[PDB]
Design a protein around this ligand. Structure first.
Ligand SMILES: CCCCCCCCCCCCCCCCCC(=O)OC[C@H](COP(=O)(O)OCCN)OC(=O)CCCCCCCCCCCCCCCCC
Ligand SMILES: CCCCCCCCCCCCCCCCCC(=O)OC[C@H](COP(=O)(O)OCCN)OC(=O)CCCCCCCCCCCCCCCCC
Ligand SMILES: CCCCCCCCCCCCCCCCCC(=O)OC[C@H](COP(=O)(O)OCCN)OC(=O)CCCCCCCCCCCCCCCCC
Ligand SMILES: CCCCCCCCCCCCCCCCCC(=O)OC[C@H](COP(=O)(O)OCCN)OC(=O)CCCCCCCCCCCCCCCCC
Ligand SMILES: CCCCCCCCCCCCCCCCCC(=O)OC[C@H](COP(=O)(O)OCCN)OC(=O)CCCCCCCCCCCCCCCCC
Ligand SMILES: CCCCCCCCCCCCCCCCCC(=O)OC[C@H](COP(=O)(O)OCCN)OC(=O)CCCCCCCCCCCCCCCCC
Ligand SMILES: CCCCCCCCCCCCCCCCCC(=O)OC[C@H](COP(=O)(O)OCCN)OC(=O)CCCCCCCCCCCCCCCCC
Ligand SMILES: CCCCCCCCCCCCCCCCCC(=O)OC[C@H](COP(=O)(O)OCCN)OC(=O)CCCCCCCCCCCCCCCCC
Ligand SMILES: CCCCCCCCCCCC(=O)OC[C@H](COP(=O)(O)OCC[N+](C)(C)C)OC(=O)CCCCCCCCCCC
Ligand SMILES: CCCCCCCCCCCC(=O)OC[C@H](COP(=O)(O)OCC[N+](C)(C)C)OC(=O)CCCCCCCCCCC
Ligand SMILES: CCCCCCCCCCCC(=O)OC[C@H](COP(=O)(O)OCC[N+](C)(C)C)OC(=O)CCCCCCCCCCC
Ligand SMILES: CCCCCCCCCCCC(=O)OC[C@H](COP(=O)(O)OCC[N+](C)(C)C)OC(=O)CCCCCCCCCCC
Lengths: 132, 90, 491, 77, 642
């Protein structure tokens, strides 16, 4: 069922500060009546030293599955898509280009693409239409 | 009225003369701001050329774009401390 | 016509308040009329003094030439030369503006001794303002540390429960570090026989001696901005000092370190500043990143605001140490913008919430927009200004400082862009909590923001928006002065 | 005046603990590891990167001198 | 005309924000609607003048930044691209505002809601009309600001408050990268103006262009809720339905697409970024569709549909088909807004205001007008031939195969499955809400009625635009040779021919067969063989259902791992550094050192002749000893302090 968030210490010794079991106030029963109904807290109830990580204003904690199991599924999902992508690449099953890619006249539109002379023709031209 | 820069070079003054040194620092700074003004005017030509040319901006504004990219690395404020405290000849 | 008039008028102002209030102290058991209404007639005179101080610099501003290189309004007074340039002019105006604002913040929330508080505030404003117009290192240091004596007593008398600890922190942190800066100043007076700004800028010292001088000066500066890891005094001082003390400390004092870099490091130790720039960036980047993450775990309302100032001034240090005009101008713009938004956050926290409930713990406050809508409007607007949202002067300062950092160092200077995310993380988490959910069960319904607190928030918001939308008011004055600080030899 | 805030003892103890965590800090092996990472290891990583690429990034108006697209297409057949 | 189009929505926000108390609820809502309508009419006039007459409008208010060579002005331009973005923005905003008049009629804070709603419209107008990237950034930031105030409008609700914070902080993550990209733009080109930067794209280093547009890509993912920065999108459903209708149709969700299309002249010269955009859009399309088929909240399903459709625009950008992305963006803004409006009409029609589709059933006869709007919008979403979505979405899926590269072929399958899922969750959503056996109590059905005319009016206008809009505007954006110089397509990247002609005839109908045919199979199983979908029996099906119902566990991973660790780093910094070593090397450590040293010195001060005599005689050893031993004496003295 529920479990505490990460980085919540099991023990602490802050002098004479009371030592209480760390409780996530987000998991408390909402149908009960509290002095502070919004935060699910009664007046003068002691606070954990890291209560800011275990209250309503803390990030919402998800406890449907364990993080290791949740990360196993997350890697498995993208692992399937990775194998599916690599097989088609290594196998080379993706279709070939039906025709020669588009060609353009005037030395592959070199002058219209910022070229200055014949030295910089290949630096700016597109695929040159060799068949005039 | 429009006061003009008192052209003075660090290479023709004595730094012990605080007035001559002050003019050399001011003269170098004022020439650097003229380069920035020139750069902004040249960029205005590039902006106007790009809009009116449309798909022809590569050809119509080729020389202007080349000029802007060459002037950009050095058409900026560089200060006077660098040249005042250093002798390039040595 | 500036320093002479400013010192003489304020000294006469100090004497005038002392004569009136202390005339009947001779065990008279008297009642008197000046002390009626919490010494209203003595607070009013001190408030008028602060306003007149602003007019003094405005008269000299009319004659200021933005196209003139070098110091203007050069004046000899007390065997000291005083001058004004573009950078000094704006910082003086900010210091004097916060004068009346600091006094008005503690108008009717002090337990007594208003006359002592008023004189101390006006004395601090003038001393800090004079520190921007001195033209030598010795005069700079004299005014740099003269503010400690009025500030130490001010915190220890009008402070919060831990005022004793805060008074020790500010006195010892800022003196032990400034003494290392005095050593570098003493070295200048030994080998050059002068500490004049213009005289020492033209002298090139050995690369080893410049390293020693830079370290001595930077220790005094780094503690005062402040930078990590010498920053721990600032959260304690802000959380315990009175609201007017916090406004001056956050709005003026922390800006003296940035101005100190302009005067004491860049034009006189230019060669070693280039070498130290990677080290300064690493310290400031870690100061920015660490402070933002540390702010996420704070529970004191006023401490959260104190840490926010550390992160912003880290950007100012990064921008001011960039060797280009974009970074330098942006750092100066951010200092002016921070000089208004940061006091406003203390006013909202330590002046509005604290003056009603007297508790600075965050757990007692939530859903304040239900019965304090006017408070929440200013809190949200100033929260977005503090996070660098456009239309505010902070965004103009932060963007140019980040841009200047990238120009100075494209690789590690890019890390300064993390301030856009990190600043919104801690600032909005505080604002989202203070306005969200139902009204706090630990609070009783009371008055919203009053007219006096409305005036303080509005006239701190107005300069931020004006600078944010049209920063050319500031850039035009700074452009000629800031261009002198750049060190480069392009061939 | 009217004590508009209902002070809570648990909140005060929680607040006092947060403001005085330095009293109970111990320079153990756990603390030393965190101190080393934040104050030595992390600055060293930035320290190396800052000087490795210091003055080696001329990005102002950097020009392209290599063609982007391929001229001739080689079919897989 | 340009000034009236841009700043009129700002006037409505100011009027309701500060004068809404003095004019009442009703007049505040209509004045805001009036201000948006003025912008609507002015935009349509400009659309004819700009698109058809090839005219441009530029207004320069004043200079903003004048730091040496960096000059930025408060200037706004209306070119083909800007006015193309304005039509979805202002028109849908007006229809949402008209929709909001009757939907929010029972809310106690209507004046503030319309003030925030019109402010968002003004922020988006500034985003697409600025003539430089910094003016774009102004709208970019206030879009997140207004959305934060809209998602958390019901600030008394804890979930809405935290959801608004989630949207703001994730979008600020993109803003941090966006600032970094603009700074690099100033570093390389010394300007942020469109007319300056776009004129140097072919001459800049490819590495420099990649860094700038990688920052743009990260910023785009946050706004467009692509993979890795999409958790906030579903949390945006905490706000009122009019917010969701406006947000997910022609607003913040589409801001990421516009940024990449604006940067098309730069984006064409860094093919590696295009490869990243193509995969990021393709992955988000596949993931979003799978999640939407096991979701129960009606607004969550539509929100997931928005994420799936935005990715379709991204893959079009990834293949340099900026015209395809823009046209699908305009069409999507019309029928997706209709879905949210009609979804909010179903929630208002039911008395309990339930939002789970599992509690719906048999609404088709009771609310036929809402059903037809959903039915027509669903078919338009499913790219049914003849409708707006068919002319805008089907071509993009074809363009993946027409690219004829390895990445395009893989994304084609992802897009094909996305298209199949798009029909699958539309049929599933319709069946649960309108065709399933009733699940809600009988008392709900005897009080189930359609809403008023004011709510209906925007939906009918959108419904007609969801039938004929795409057919009329296809030639403007998808026509061959149409001049759209604002979007630059390199000659080597024009694949509109190989996509149109070389495609096998089977691929032209394959999405249709999988959509309608796959939808019929799902419909038959639900009606007659529902025992198959009792997935709580099978263990693998339960895990598979749970994995996609929890949205690829990304929300759990983001919170339990990334956000928690980021907060713990601050805790570690606070405990071990700020309150730790800096206190040992600080006031606390020096106090213990001072106490130890001063205690020793206190015992050395007492009146004793023998004590002082020995010290005086001991000092005589300094004279005797050679001075090179002073440091050894110094170490010895410290040893005695211990
Ligand atoms: C009327 C008679 C008044 C005295 C006239 C006089 O000759 O005193 C000298 C000076 C007047 O100025 P002047 O003589 O023109 O030369 C500049 C020196 N300040 O007048 C003075 O110098 C009087 C200055 C008194 C105020 C100085 C107190 C210092 C304030 C603390 C230091 C803060 C800055 C460091
Ligand atoms: C909220 C987000 C806040 C920000 C998050 C952090 C992002 C900012 C920092 C990341 C870096 C930003 C971009 C910097 C790289 C841009 C420069 C570049 O184009 O990379 C390649 C370039 C080499 O160029 P080249 O021409 O090959 O050199 C030939 C020399 N004869 O130069 C290089 O060799 C690359 C330099 C090494 C890569 C450094 C990046 C790692 C930085 C780690 C920071 C700590 C985490
Ligand atoms: C809540 C607290 C209160 C704060 C809220 C109000 C904040 C208002 C902020 C305004 C800041 C001042 C900006 C206007 C000052 C005038 C600027 C100026 O000096 O003129 C510049 C411009 C041409 O320059 P020039 O030829 O030199 O003329 C100078 C003649 N002496 O001359 C001009 O063209 C003048 C143009 C005046 C424009 C009027 C202001 C319009 C609104 C701001 C426009 C900014 C762009 C839109 C921002 C919205 C977001 C997109
Ligand atoms: C620069 C000098 C660096 C000295 C490092 C001292 C670190 C330190 O304070 O040690 C911790 C110890 C206090 O004990 P504790 O905090 O409990 O840690 C024990 C963990 N098992 O502290 C001690 O054991 C007491 C010894 C402190 C010695 C301080 C001497 C300072 C002299 C040079 C000042 C400069
Ligand atoms: C709180 C209010 C505090 C107000 C303090 C700030 C006052 C601003 C100073 C106004 C200066 C007068 C002025 O506006 O300049 C005249 C100028 C027209 O002259 P010109 O120089 O030719 O401008 C052409 C620019 N290409 O006019 C302009 O150029 C102004 C153009 C503004 C651009 C459109 C307006 C943007 C803002 C829309 C809301 C404002 C309009 C509604 C006014 C009532 C609500 C404020
Ligand atoms: C870089 C890693 C993140 C480092 C940032 C510092 C750590 C987080 C600090 C943010 C403050 C946390 C906070 O204010 O509370 C958590 C807040 C609650 O919102 P939430 O839990 O989502 O409630 C939803 C209800 N339906 O949740 C939030 O509002 C946080 C929103 C997300 C913050 C964005 C941080 C960057 C996200 C991209 C990194 C992950 C890429 C994958
Ligand atoms: C967000 C973080 C802040 C911004 C970080 C920017 C990092 C992107 C830098 C891209 C780059 O440096 O371009 C070069 C890149 C790798 O360099 P390389 O392939 O070895 O040499 C190419 C020389 N033309 O070459 C490539 O374009 C291919 C690899 C790109 C990786 C993208 C992921
Ligand atoms: C730039 C600033 C970021 C510096 C990264 C420092 C990472 C780090 O030190 O994390 C330490 C922490 C493990 O420390 P801790 O959890 O206290 O181990 C004892 C548990 N009983 O591990 C963490 O808290 C997770 C940090 C992961 C993100 C880095
Ligand atoms: C997590 C798993 C996500 C999917 C893994 C893809 C595996 C693969 O094979 O992807 C290979 C692809 C394709 O480029 P290529 O085949 O390397 O070169 C061929 C270059 N074309 C396509 C221009 C001809 O590139 C990538 O990786 C895409 C970037 C990573 C996206 C995430
Ligand atoms: C710019 C140069 C200024 C220098 C001179 C300033 C005035 C000095 C005090 C003389 C008059 C006086 O002691 O009078 C006392 C005044 C008036 O306070 P009050 O509330 O009326 O007194 C209480 C009596 N009741 C209760 C009956 C009303 O308070 C002050 O002490 C304010 C001035 C001192 C502030 C800083 C103190 C430390 C200074 C350290 C310097 C490095
Ligand atoms: C180079 C940059 C230098 C920056 C400043 C240096 C550290 C300043 C520490 C503040 C001390 C303070 O405030 O003194 C006050 C503190 C009071 O301690 P407290 O806070 O009440 O807790 C401790 C009390 N208990 C345990 C009861 C709660 O007494 C001390 O510690 C006395 C020793 C201070 C000596 C400082 C000399 C510094 C020498 C120069 C640097 C090598
Ligand atoms: C495209 C390829 C076909 C995908 C659609 C199949 C129909 C479907 O997903 O539905 C079939 C079932 C259940 O039915 P349901 O749709 O969840 O509705 C019924 C709602 N119950 C279950 C509460 C009654 O779902 C699943 O658990 C299928 C796996 C979940 C992810 C979807 C496919 C992932 C691979």
């Amino acid at each position: 069922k529920s479990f505490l968030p990460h980085f919540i210490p099991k023990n602490y010794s802050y002098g004479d500060y009371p030592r209480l079991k760390p409780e996530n106030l987000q998991k408390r029963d909402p149908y009960l009546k509290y002095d502070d109904q919004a935060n699910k807290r009664n007046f003068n109830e002691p606070l954990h030293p890291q209560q800011d990580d275990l209250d309503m204003w803390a990030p919402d904690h998800f406890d449907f599955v364990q993080d290791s199991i949740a990360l196993k599924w997350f890697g498995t999902f993208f692992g399937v898509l990775a194998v599916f992508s690599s097989v088609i690449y290594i196998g080379g099953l993706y279709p070939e280009k039906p025709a020669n890619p588009r060609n353009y006249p005037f030395s592959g539109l070199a002058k219209d693409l910022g070229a200055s002379s014949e030295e910089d023709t290949l630096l700016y031209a597109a695929k040159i239409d060799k068949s005039i | 009225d429009h006061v003009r820069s008192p052209n003075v070079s660090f290479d023709d003054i004595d730094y012990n003369n605080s007035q001559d040194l002050h003019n050399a620092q001011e003269s170098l700074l004022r020439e650097q701001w003229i380069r920035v003004s020139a750069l902004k005017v040249c960029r205005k030509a590039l902006e106007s050329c790009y809009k009116t040319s449309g798909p022809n901006h590569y050809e119509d504004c080729r020389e202007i774009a080349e000029k802007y990219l060459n002037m950009l690395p050095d058409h900026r404020i560089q200060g006077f401390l660098g040249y005042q405290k250093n002798d390039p000849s040595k | 016509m500036l320093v002479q008039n400013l010192i003489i008028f304020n000294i006469i102002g100090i004497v005038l308040l002392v004569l009136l209030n202390n005339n009947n102290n001779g065990i008279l058991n008297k009642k008197s009329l000046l002390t009626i209404k919490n010494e209203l007639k003595l607070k009013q005179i001190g408030l008028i003094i602060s306003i007149i101080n602003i007019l003094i610099i405005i008269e000299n501003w009319i004659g200021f030439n933005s196209n003139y290189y070098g110091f203007q309004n050069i004046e000899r007074f007390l065997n000291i030369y005083w001058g004004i340039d573009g950078i000094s002019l704006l910082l003086v105006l900010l210091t004097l503006i916060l004068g009346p604002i600091a006094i008005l913040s503690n108008w009717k929330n002090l337990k007594g001794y208003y006359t002592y508080y008023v004189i101390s505030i006006n004395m601090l404003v003038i001393l800090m303002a004079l520190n921007f117009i001195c033209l030598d290192l010795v005069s700079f240091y004299i005014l740099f540390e003269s503010t400690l004596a009025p500030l130490f007593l001010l915190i220890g008398i009008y402070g919060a429960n831990n005022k004793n600890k805060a008074a020790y922190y500010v006195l010892i942190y800022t003196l032990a570090s400034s003494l290392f800066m005095l050593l570098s100043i003493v070295i200048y007076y030994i080998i050059i026989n002068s500490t004049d700004y213009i005289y020492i800028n033209n002298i090139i010292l050995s690369i080893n001696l410049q390293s020693l001088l830079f370290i001595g000066i930077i220790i005094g500066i780094a503690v005062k901005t402040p930078l990590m890891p010498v920053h721990t005094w600032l959260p304690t001082v802000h959380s315990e000092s009175p609201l007017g003390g916090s406004i001056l400390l956050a709005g003026v004092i922390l800006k003296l370190a940035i101005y100190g870099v302009i005067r004491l490091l860049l034009p006189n130790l230019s060669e070693i500043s280039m070498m130290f720039t990677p080290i300064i960036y690493i310290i400031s980047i870690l100061t920015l990143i660490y402070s933002s993450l540390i702010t996420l775990k704070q529970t004191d309302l006023k401490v959260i605001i104190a840490y926010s100032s550390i992160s912003h001034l880290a950007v100012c240090m990064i921008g001011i140490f960039a060797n280009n005009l974009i970074g330098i101008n942006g750092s100066l713009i951010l200092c002016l913008a921070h000089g208004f938004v940061s006091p406003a956050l203390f006013i909202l926290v330590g002046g509005i919430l604290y003056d009603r409930y007297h508790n600075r713990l965050i757990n007692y406050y939530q859903g304040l927009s239900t019965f304090m809508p006017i408070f929440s409007i200013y809190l949200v607007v100033f929260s977005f200004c503090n996070t660098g949202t456009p239309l505010s002067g902070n965004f103009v300062g932060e963007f140019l400082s980040i841009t200047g950092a990238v120009i100075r160092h494209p690789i590690i200077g890019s890390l300064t862009a993390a301030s856009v995310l990190l600043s919104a993380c801690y600032q909005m988490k505080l604002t989202n909590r203070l306005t969200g959910s139902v009204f706090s069960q630990y609070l009783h319904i009371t008055n919203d923001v009053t007219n006096r607190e409305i005036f303080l928030l509005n006239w701190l918001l107005i300069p931020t928006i004006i600078i944010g939308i049209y920063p050319s008011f500031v850039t035009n004055i700074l452009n000629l002065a800031s261009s002198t600080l750049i060190y480069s030899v392009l061939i | 005046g009217p004590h508009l805030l209902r002070e809570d003892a648990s909140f005060q103890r929680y607040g006092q603990l947060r403001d005085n965590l330095a009293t109970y800090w111990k320079f153990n092996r756990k603390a030393a590891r965190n101190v080393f990472i934040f104050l030595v290891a992390v600055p060293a990583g930035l320290g190396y990167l800052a000087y490795n690429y210091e003055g080696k990034t001329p990005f102002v108006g950097k020009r392209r001198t290599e063609p982007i697209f391929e001229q001739d297409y080689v079919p897989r057949k | 005309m340009i000034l009236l189009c841009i700043f009129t929505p700002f006037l409505g926000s100011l009027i309701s924000g500060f004068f809404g108390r003095y004019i009442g609820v009703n007049s505040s809502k209509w004045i805001v609607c009036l201000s948006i309508f003025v912008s609507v009419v002015s935009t349509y006039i400009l659309f004819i003048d700009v698109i058809f007459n090839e005219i441009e409008y530029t207004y320069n208010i004043m200079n903003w930044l004048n730091v040496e060579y960096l000059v930025v002005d408060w200037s706004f331009t209306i070119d083909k691209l800007s006015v193309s973005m304005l039509v979805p923005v202002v028109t849908v905003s007006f229809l949402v505002h008209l929709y909001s008049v009757s939907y929010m009629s029972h809310d106690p804070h209507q004046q503030r809601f319309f003030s925030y709603l019109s402010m968002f419209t003004f922020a988006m107008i500034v985003l697409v009309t600025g003539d430089n990237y910094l003016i774009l950034f102004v709208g970019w930031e206030f879009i997140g600001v207004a959305s934060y105030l809209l998602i958390s409008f019901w600030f008394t609700r804890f979930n809405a408050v935290k959801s608004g914070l989630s949207a703001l902080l994730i979008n600020r993550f993109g803003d941090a990268l966006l600032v970094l990209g603009l700074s690099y733009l100033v570093l390389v080109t010394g300007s942020v103006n469109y007319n300056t930067v776009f004129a140097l794209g072919s001459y800049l280093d490819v590495n420099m262009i990649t860094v700038i547009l990688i920052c743009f890509l990260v910023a785009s993912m946050a706004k467009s809720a692509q993979l890795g920065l999409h958790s906030w999108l579903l949390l945006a459903m905490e706000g009122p339905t009019p917010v969701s209708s406006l947000l997910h149709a022609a607003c913040l969700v589409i801001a990421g697409v516009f940024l990449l299309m604006r940067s098309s002249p730069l984006l064409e010269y860094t093919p590696i970024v295009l490869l990243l955009i193509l995969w990021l859009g393709g992955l988000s399309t596949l993931i979003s569709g799978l999640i939407a088929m096991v979701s129960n909240d009606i607004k969550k399903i539509i929100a997931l549909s928005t994420m799936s459709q935005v990715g379709i625009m991204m893959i079009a950008i990834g293949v340099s088909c900026y015209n395809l992305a823009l046209f699908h963006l305009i069409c999507h803004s019309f029928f997706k807004a209709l879905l949210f409006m009609s979804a909010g009409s179903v929630i208002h029609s039911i008395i309990s205001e339930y939002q789970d589709i599992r509690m719906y059933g048999g609404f088709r006869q009771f609310i036929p007008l809402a059903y037809t709007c959903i039915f027509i919008a669903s078919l338009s979403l499913m790219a049914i031939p003849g409708l707006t979505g068919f002319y805008s979405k089907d071509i993009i899926i074809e363009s993946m195969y027409g690219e004829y590269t390895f990445s395009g072929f893989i994304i084609y399958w992802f897009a094909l499955i996305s298209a199949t899922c798009t029909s699958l969750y539309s049929i599933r959503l319709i069946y649960y809400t309108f065709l399933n056996n009733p699940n809600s109590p009988k008392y709900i059905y005897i009080n189930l009625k359609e809403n008023d005319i004011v709510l209906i009016t925007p939906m009918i206008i959108l419904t007609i635009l969801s039938i004929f809009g795409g057919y009329l505007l296809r030639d403007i954006y998808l026509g061959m040779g149409s001049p759209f110089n604002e979007l630059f397509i390199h000659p080597n990247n024009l694949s509109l021919i190989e996509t149109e002609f070389s495609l096998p005839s089977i691929l032209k109908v394959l999405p249709l067969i999988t959509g309608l045919g796959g939808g019929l199979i799902l419909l038959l199983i639900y009606e007659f063989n529902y025992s198959l979908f009792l997935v709580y029996n099978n263990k693998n099906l339960s895990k598979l259902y749970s994995f996609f119902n929890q949205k690829i566990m990304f929300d759990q991973l983001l919170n339990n791992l990334i956000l928690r660790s980021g907060l713990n780093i601050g805790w570690l910094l606070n405990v071990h550094i700020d309150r730790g070593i800096l206190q040992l090397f600080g006031p606390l450590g020096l106090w213990k050192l001072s106490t130890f040293i001063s205690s020793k010195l206190n015992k050395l001060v007492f009146l004793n002749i023998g004590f002082i005599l020995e010290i005086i005689v001991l000092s005589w050893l300094l004279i005797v000893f050679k001075v090179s031993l002073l440091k050894y004496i110094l170490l010895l003295i410290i040893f005695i302090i211990l």
